[PDB]
Amino acid sequence: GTRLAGILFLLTVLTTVLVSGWVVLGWMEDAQRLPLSKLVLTGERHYTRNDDIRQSILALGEPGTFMTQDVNIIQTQIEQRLQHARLDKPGARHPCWP
Amino acid sequence: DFQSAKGGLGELKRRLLFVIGALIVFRIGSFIPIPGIDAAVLAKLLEQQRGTIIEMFNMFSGGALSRASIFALGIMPYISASIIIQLLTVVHPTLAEIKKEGESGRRKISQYTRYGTLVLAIFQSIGIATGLPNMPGMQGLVINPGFAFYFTAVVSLVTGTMFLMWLGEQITERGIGNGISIIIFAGIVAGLPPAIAHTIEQARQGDLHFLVLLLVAVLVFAVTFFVVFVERGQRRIVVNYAKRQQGRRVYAAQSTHLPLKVNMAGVIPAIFASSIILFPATIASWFGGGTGWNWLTTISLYLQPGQPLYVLLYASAIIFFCFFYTALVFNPRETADNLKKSGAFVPGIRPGEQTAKYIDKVMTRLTLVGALYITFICLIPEFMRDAMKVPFYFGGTSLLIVVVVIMDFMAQVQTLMMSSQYESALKKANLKGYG
Amino acid sequence: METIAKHRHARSSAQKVRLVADLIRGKKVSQALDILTYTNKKAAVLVKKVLESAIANAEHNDGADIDDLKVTKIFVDEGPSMKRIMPRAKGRADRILKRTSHITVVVSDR
Amino acid sequence: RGLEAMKWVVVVALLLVAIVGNYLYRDIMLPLRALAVVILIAAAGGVALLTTKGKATVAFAREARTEVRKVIWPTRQETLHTTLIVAAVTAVMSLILWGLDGILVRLVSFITGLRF
Amino acid sequence: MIREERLLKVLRAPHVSEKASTAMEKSNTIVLKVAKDATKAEIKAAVQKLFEVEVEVVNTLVVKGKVKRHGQRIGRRSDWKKAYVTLKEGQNLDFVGGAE
Amino acid sequence: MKAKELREKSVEELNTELLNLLREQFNLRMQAASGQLQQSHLLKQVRRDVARVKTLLNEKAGA
RNA sequence: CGAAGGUGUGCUGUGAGGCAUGCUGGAGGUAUCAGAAGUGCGAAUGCUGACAUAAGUAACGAUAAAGCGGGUGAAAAGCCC
Ligand SMILES: CCCCCC/C=C/CCCCCCCCCC(=O)O[C@@H](COC(=O)CCCCCCCCCCCCCCC)COP(=O)(O)OC[C@H](O)CO
Ligand SMILES: CCCCCC/C=C/CCCCCCCCCC(=O)O[C@H](COC(=O)CCCCCCCCCCCCCCC)COP(=O)(O)OC[C@H](O)CO
Ligand SMILES: CCCCCC/C=C\CCCCCCCCCC(=O)O[C@@H](COC(=O)CCCCCCCCCCCCCCC)COP(=O)(O)OC[C@H](O)CO
Numbered sequence A: 001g002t003r004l005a006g007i008l009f010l011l012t013v014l015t016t017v018l019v020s021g022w023v024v025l026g027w028m029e030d031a032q033r034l035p036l037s038k039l040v041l042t043g044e045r046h047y048t049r050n051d052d053i054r055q056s057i058l059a060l061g062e063p064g065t066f067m068t069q070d071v072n073i074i075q076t077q078i079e080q081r082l083q084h085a086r087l088d089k090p091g092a093r094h095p096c097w098p
Numbered sequence B: 001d002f003q004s005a006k007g008g009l010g011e012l013k014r015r016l017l018f019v020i021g022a023l024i025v026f027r028i029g030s031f032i033p034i035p036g037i038d039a040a041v042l043a044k045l046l047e048q049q050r051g052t053i054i055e056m057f058n059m060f061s062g063g064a065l066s067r068a069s070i071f072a073l074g075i076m077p078y079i080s081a082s083i084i085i086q087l088l089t090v091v092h093p094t095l096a097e098i099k100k101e102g103e104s105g106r107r108k109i110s111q112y113t114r115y116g117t118l119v120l121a122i123f124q125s126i127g128i129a130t131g132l133p134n135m136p137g138m139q140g141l142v143i144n145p146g147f148a149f150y151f152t153a154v155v156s157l158v159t160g161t162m163f164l165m166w167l168g169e170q171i172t173e174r175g176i177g178n179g180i181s182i183i184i185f186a187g188i189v190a191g192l193p194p195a196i197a198h199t200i201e202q203a204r205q206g207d208l209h210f211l212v213l214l215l216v217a218v219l220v221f222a223v224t225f226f227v228v229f230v231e232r233g234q235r236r237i238v239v240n241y242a243k244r245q246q247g248r249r250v251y252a253a254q255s256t257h258l259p260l261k262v263n264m265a266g267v268i269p270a271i272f273a274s275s276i277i278l279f280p281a282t283i284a285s286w287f288g289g290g291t292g293w294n295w296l297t298t299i300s301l302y303l304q305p306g307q308p309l310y311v312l313l314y315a316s317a318i319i320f321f322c323f324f325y326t327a328l329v330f331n332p333r334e335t336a337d338n339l340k341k342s343g344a345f346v347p348g349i350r351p352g353e354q355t356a357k358y359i360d361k362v363m364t365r366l367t368l369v370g371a372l373y374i375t376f377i378c379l380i381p382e383f384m385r386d387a388m389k390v391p392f393y394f395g396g397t398s399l400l401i402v403v404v405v406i407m408d409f410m411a412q413v414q415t416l417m418m419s420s421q422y423e424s425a426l427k428k429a430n431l432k433g434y435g
Numbered sequence C: 001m002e003t004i005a006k007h008r009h010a011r012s013s014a015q016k017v018r019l020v021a022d023l024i025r026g027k028k029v030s031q032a033l034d035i036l037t038y039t040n041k042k043a044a045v046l047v048k049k050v051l052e053s054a055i056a057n058a059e060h061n062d063g064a065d066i067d068d069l070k071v072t073k074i075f076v077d078e079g080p081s082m083k084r085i086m087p088r089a090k091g092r093a094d095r096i097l098k099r100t101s102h103i104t105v106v107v108s109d110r
Numbered sequence D: 001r002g003l004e005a006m007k008w009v010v011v012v013a014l015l016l017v018a019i020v021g022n023y024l025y026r027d028i029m030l031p032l033r034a035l036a037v038v039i040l041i042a043a044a045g046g047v048a049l050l051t052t053k054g055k056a057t058v059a060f061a062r063e064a065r066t067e068v069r070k071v072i073w074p075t076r077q078e079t080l081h082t083t084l085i086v087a088a089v090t091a092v093m094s095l096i097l098w099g100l101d102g103i104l105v106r107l108v109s110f111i112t113g114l115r116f
Numbered sequence E: 001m002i003r004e005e006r007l008l009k010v011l012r013a014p015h016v017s018e019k020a021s022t023a024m025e026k027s028n029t030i031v032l033k034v035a036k037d038a039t040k041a042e043i044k045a046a047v048q049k050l051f052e053v054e055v056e057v058v059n060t061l062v063v064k065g066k067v068k069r070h071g072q073r074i075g076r077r078s079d080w081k082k083a084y085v086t087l088k089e090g091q092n093l094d095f096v097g098g099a100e
Numbered sequence F: 001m002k003a004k005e006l007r008e009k010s011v012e013e014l015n016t017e018l019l020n021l022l023r024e025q026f027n028l029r030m031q032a033a034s035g036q037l038q039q040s041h042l043l044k045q046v047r048r049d050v051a052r053v054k055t056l057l058n059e060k061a062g063a
Numbered sequence G: 001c002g003a004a005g006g007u008g009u010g011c012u013g014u015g016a017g018g019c020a021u022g023c024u025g026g027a028g029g030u031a032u033c034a035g036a037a038g039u040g041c042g043a044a045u046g047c048u049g050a051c052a053u054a055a056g057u058a059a060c061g062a063u064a065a066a067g068c069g070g071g072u073g074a075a076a077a078g079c080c081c
């Protein structure tokens, strides 16, 4: 079947896939072993937040290709004819009757 | 555009229903917690700006098991919808529900392809929704007519998406691609970042508001210039017209023959650039050892483990992928040969084979218009003006997506306002086959 | 009326077309024109096209009724005689006329 | 004429003056262990191209000029200007959207995530 | 010199299209419309001095034109000559041949 | 036309017409005849310009 | 606000003809009196063009017979296979 179609799936998948694979690891890593509660203050926030934590990465377009073409020149059935005059009358007759 | 041709009787009283009942489509995604409410059209946490921090990678929009990003779940549902519309029409006269039935067949295949794509939409929510109630996202309470959790978590997330999906394959009577993508544009734009439009820090360029708004208007502009073909045949010059008379005198002038011609090169993807730059810098750095991304905040450049090496490799590949692939098995140009027997007399007829090694090398060497389209719209948030560590100084997937509907408005109206098509000059020519 | 159709300037023996004009005159449409499509001569299937065109003009465009349409008058008038030669014999040639007709159908109301 | 060659003119002006200046920029003229060998490398590459001039290496022009030059030619032929006027009604719309949105998303968030 | 510019005025159009003129450039030879010069020697020396093409046997053939059978007076297309110039080196990819 | 002819000089003009004909018209007329650079206005010029130079030579031995 | 011409009609003069008028026609035409003509046609085995007549008649060009099945096409005894 079409191979272009196969690529189309591959590209879309690939761009998303690299982000997702990376993302699960991605956090900021480090395996810190917890200073525990020895008073101090805990927790953090940011100003606003970018939604709740669920995967959204999004894509796609079209089957592609564009075309333009020209059309002109059609349709004639037309005549044109000629003729000319003539003359001819041969001999080969002897008119006597015996 | 939005159209109606919905199943059951009438189609002009389905138009009446359509606008009113679009309120109902918005309502059930937003509210009613029985088939879920989260993550399809409804944000559960107010306002906008990054929620993952402490990485260069997190500037792009990052993540941390699944990701902090605005709604439109997974990646699987919408992407496969247009692909299997294309795939079944071209490859399969057998085990397909159309053989291509015209405009009627465009809407027909979309219905069936929705079922074929529903299975794909399942898959991601299996992983997401077992992790989800142990972190943000948990609704307010789901009553649950079920008594399970195994299918129950999966179902709630999918259904919200499904409502939007159904209507989206209904509008596809006039059946072109870049349809799916528009529905998908809306969700990401609506949530992502105008609260401060470009984060300020009292620096060279980040010091004023509404900077981002200016940038978007050029990005559409490129896509609308894109549809222009490339043209130029042998073509000669126009010298003659002719009149109707019963004796003739002169006919023929301009004639256009297609070997195929450039159909545009960069076509199809709509978020492509942003992810390419991102991956090989990251994987070397800190899924390995090393460091290197975008850094600094000045016009000292940086931007050195990404940008133009992203282009060469990927760019070249994708554009040739268009030309080459299809050419081997099932291609526009097949179309040209049929449609131009009526061409005959002057530009050539039977020869050896029409075109040869000429068309081959042509599409190959080219590559330049593939560079132009791909680089110009994406370079804009990649460099911007500096190298700052606030958003839009590498990555720009947000501004790639939006452009698609914007283009539509002038193009689509011209086709709509008449029962259009073109051509009429033949009836199938009589065959003289010899030699 | 405005529902008519006619033909002009085509080669054909005009006398033979004349015979089948009379045959179907005043006998309405598609109930005596079915004769033509099942009988001798190519003159039959030549006037048939002129008939079903007048009918199609009393249907589409002007009018809308073809069961209230009768082929009132149908005839055919002598067309051009397009001069040509046959080299007859003995260096003497004699003119062949290429007979032509102007088929005239005039449908009106039934 | 200009269809049989292009690149040569712009090379010469830069070559005569630029090379010396390139070392200086951003306050370096000093050995960090030596440097100044940078002048030799800059000169050396220009030599190579110049002495191989006939159809000169990199892209070349024996037969390879016809390849690139005539897939460039039809593509840039078409009129940019005609498109441009039509386009600029879609452009102005786009701008509006990307400031608009924030209010609507915030509104729906409040009245969800709470159910009795 | 060996010849003037008016003995290098000998080409006004090639032939590079359709049967036995695309086929007989790919498979063999090269073919071009050679005005109406009526020489073979100066056409060999044309592709020496201009271009840099090397040739084998140069073949000359008169083309008597072809009918335009709708009259007015005489009609018909004008005379010209076709020549199979024949490559021995060059291997040109159309609209290349040499020029320094 | 006017000033063109008048500023011509024997030694000069001789070598200028060689350029005109060959590799400014030679290329042009071949390209144009195959539709690969067919621009009709360029054909009209060059042709009716190279002519001029030769005129002066047989008239008065250049300007 | 309808000429000449064409085509119907009425009237009138011994006649050659004239006048009026409807219609068609879409522009020019001309009282009166005098002068001057390539000045009036049915025939010349007249001349030229057109269209008849015989007649839907003779003939359809070799007595080296063709038949069938698919194909194309609006239609195949004749073409292609
Ligand atoms: C979003 C939409 C998708 C986009 C991406 C993919 C696009 C692909 C491009 C085009 C579509 C191609 C459709 C091909 C359909 C037919 C497949 C086929 O033919 O599969 C065969 C192999 O099956 C088997 O491996 C059965 C066991 C299979 C095990 C799993 C491996 C599957 C491999 C699939 C390869 C697909 C790509 C290549 C397609 C040519 C069937 O068995 P056979 O005995 O060989 O049949 C012989 C005769 O044909 C029928 O008697
Ligand atoms: C021919 C095509 C060229 C394309 C690229 C052109 C890039 C132009 C650069 C900048 C735009 C103009 C800037 C105007 C002056 C601004 C102030 C200034 O001069 O800034 C400097 C810019 O240096 C810098 O670009 C240092 C880095 C300069 C690198 C230049 C590299 C050129 C490479 C060309 C390679 C061949 C390309 C051939 C293409 C055909 C220093 O950087 P700042 O961050 O300010 O550091 C802070 C200051 O020390 C104190 O304030
Ligand atoms: C040309 C050779 C053949 C012909 C001449 C032969 C001459 C005789 C041969 C040899 C001479 C004896 C051996 C000399 C060895 C010199 C080694 C040397 O001195 O190498 C220096 C770097 O040279 C550098 O070209 C550093 C380069 C940095 C990257 C440059 C990237 C390209 C820039 C553009 C180049 C030109 C492009 C345009 C060309 C037309 C070492 O740099 P340091 O001072 O340590 O500072 C480095 C750090 O900043 C601090 O550690």
Ligand SMILES: CCCCCC/C=C\CCCCCCCCCC(=O)O[C@H](COC(=O)CCCCCCCCCCCCCCC)COP(=O)(O)OC[C@H](O)CO
Pocket: B218, B384, B385, D076, D077, D078, D079, D080, D081, D084
């Ligand atoms: C001393 C050395 C100094 C070096 C630095 C110099 C810097 C300034 C110089 C140059 C900058 C560009 C100025 C000219 C812009 C012209 C745009 C234009 O006019 O573009 C036209 C096309 O439209 C198009 O691109 C439509 C789009 C045109 C506008 C694009 C505007 C983009 C602006 C981006 C700005 C970003 C700033 C940072 C934001 C954070 C050009 O058409 P033509 O080729 O004429 O037509 C050809 C004919 O059809 C066929 O023959």
Ligand SMILES: CCCCCCCCCCCCCCCCCC(=O)O[C@@H](COC(=O)CCCCCCCCCCCCCCC)COP(=O)(O)OCCN
Pocket: A002, A003, A006, A007, A009, A010, A013
């Ligand atoms: C998630 C994405 C899934 C889809 C990926 C793309 C799918 C492309 C579609 C089809 C690929 C080929 C299927 C088998 C074809 C068998 C028949 C055939 O023609 O085989 C040819 C050999 O196969 C090919 O040529 C296939 C070429 C394209 C392959 C593209 C890669 C597919 C796999 C990609 C996996 C991911 C790679 C990731 C890398 C980082 C024969 O060689 P030939 O064409 O030269 O003809 C010889 C006789 N004259």
Ligand SMILES: CCCCCCCCCCCCCCCCCC(=O)O[C@@H](COC(=O)CCCCCCCCCCCCCCC)COP(=O)(O)OCCN
Pocket: A014, A017, A018, A020, A021, A022, A024
């Ligand atoms: C019945 C047939 C139909 C249903 C089939 C369902 C099952 C198969 C379907 C899909 C495969 C899903 C992925 C399986 C491999 C990866 C997950 C894994 O290895 O999980 C283990 C490891 O899990 C982890 O380390 C957490 C992260 C898991 C996801 C990792 C995704 C990596 C994606 C890489 C993409 C690379 C792309 C490269 C090209 C750009 C679980 O360990 P555990 O048993 O101790 O459970 C711990 C639970 N917290």
Ligand SMILES: CCCCCCCCCCCCCCCCCC(=O)O[C@@H](COC(=O)CCCCCCCCCCCCCCC)COP(=O)(O)OCCN
Pocket: B006, B007, B008, B017, B018, B019, B020, B021, B022, B111, B112, B115, B167
């Ligand atoms: C968007 C505006 C608001 C719309 C409101 C709709 C109200 C009902 C009106 C119309 C019915 C739905 C029309 C669209 C159907 C699209 C899918 C389709 O074509 O379905 C089948 C055809 O459907 C029809 O012809 C129309 C529906 C048949 C009759 C249904 C009767 C029961 C209706 C119950 C409505 C309950 C509403 C309750 C609201 C609270 C064919 O299926 P297939 O061949 O593609 O695939 C086979 C299955 N995999």
Ligand SMILES: CCCCCCCCCCCCCCCCCC(=O)O[C@@H](COC(=O)CCCCCCCCCCCCCCC)COP(=O)(O)OCCN
Pocket: A020, A024, A055, B065, B066, B127, B128
């Ligand atoms: C981007 C964000 C993250 C996304 C998600 C990332 C991926 C998910 C993360 C982590 C989870 C990874 C899961 C990996 C696959 C786990 C598969 C599993 O659990 O398999 C077990 C599943 O076990 C079962 O389900 C038990 C069997 C149930 C059978 C039910 C049907 C029986 C019907 C029989 C009918 C009669 C016979 C019919 C014969 C045809 C069996 O494993 P094992 O014991 O063989 O392995 C031992 C060595 N480690």
Ligand SMILES: CCCCCCCCCCCCCCCCCC(=O)O[C@@H](COC(=O)CCCCCCCCCCCCCCC)COP(=O)(O)OCCN
Pocket: B280, B281, B283, B284, B285, B287, B288, B289, B290, B291, B292, B293, B305
């Ligand atoms: C063959 C490597 C290909 C790398 C391609 C991406 C390059 C991006 C460019 C710049 C950003 C990354 C800079 C990395 C600097 C590395 C500095 C270094 O050598 O770090 C350590 C070594 O780092 C590495 O070896 C790099 C990481 C290796 C694992 C990941 C390999 C990814 C290969 C990707 C191939 C596909 C690329 C596709 C590009 C289109 C030093 O060793 P160590 O002290 O950690 O002790 C040894 C290890 N325990």
Ligand SMILES: CCCCCCCCCCCCCCCCCC(=O)O[C@@H](COC(=O)CCCCCCCCCCCCCCC)COP(=O)(O)OCCN
Pocket: B276, B277, B280, B281, B290, B291, B292, B293, B295, B304, B305, B306, B307, B309, B310
């Ligand atoms: C997109 C597809 C293609 C992917 C693969 C592309 C590969 C391109 C190859 C080379 C370009 C490398 C660009 C990245 C350079 C990263 C430099 C960097 O990260 O520098 C940091 C140090 O990183 C390292 O040491 C590891 C990475 C080194 C990469 C190679 C740098 C070469 C620089 C010139 C060396 C000249 C040696 C002269 C010897 C006398 C600086 O650390 P800092 O704390 O001072 O600054 C803040 C954090 N950036």
Ligand SMILES: CCCCCCCCCCCCCCCCCC(=O)O[C@@H](COC(=O)CCCCCCCCCCCCCCC)COP(=O)(O)OCCN
Pocket: B316, B364, B365, B366, B367, D005, D006, D007, D045, D049, D055, D056, D057, D058, D059, D060, D061, D065, D068
């Ligand atoms: C991008 C690859 C695409 C491949 C596509 C498939 C294969 C097709 C086959 C061949 C095409 C190969 C790509 C050609 C792209 C176009 C190149 C081009 O047009 O170059 C022009 C310009 O060429 C140049 O400017 C060449 C310059 C070479 C010297 C560079 C000096 C500066 C170096 C800076 C430092 C770099 C240091 C890197 C290492 C640290 C040619 O000029 P022209 O019109 O006059 O043509 C006749 C040339 N004799």
Ligand SMILES: CCCCCCCCCCCCCCCCCC(=O)O[C@H](COC(=O)CCCCCCCCCCCCCCC)COP(=O)(O)OCCN
Pocket: B034, B035, B144, B145, B146, B147, B148, B149, B151, B152, B155
């Ligand atoms: C089985 C009885 C309970 C559920 C009845 C259906 C409720 C439909 C309402 C809303 C859909 C969203 C909530 C679904 C909750 C989870 C249901 C579930 O997981 O059912 C499973 C059984 O599901 C199946 O057997 C079928 C699964 C595939 C089809 C699911 C279709 C759901 C929607 C049907 C709508 C029909 C009417 C539409 C027009 C008004 C497991 O059974 P259980 O919940 O009773 O737990 C006991 C075992 N641990």
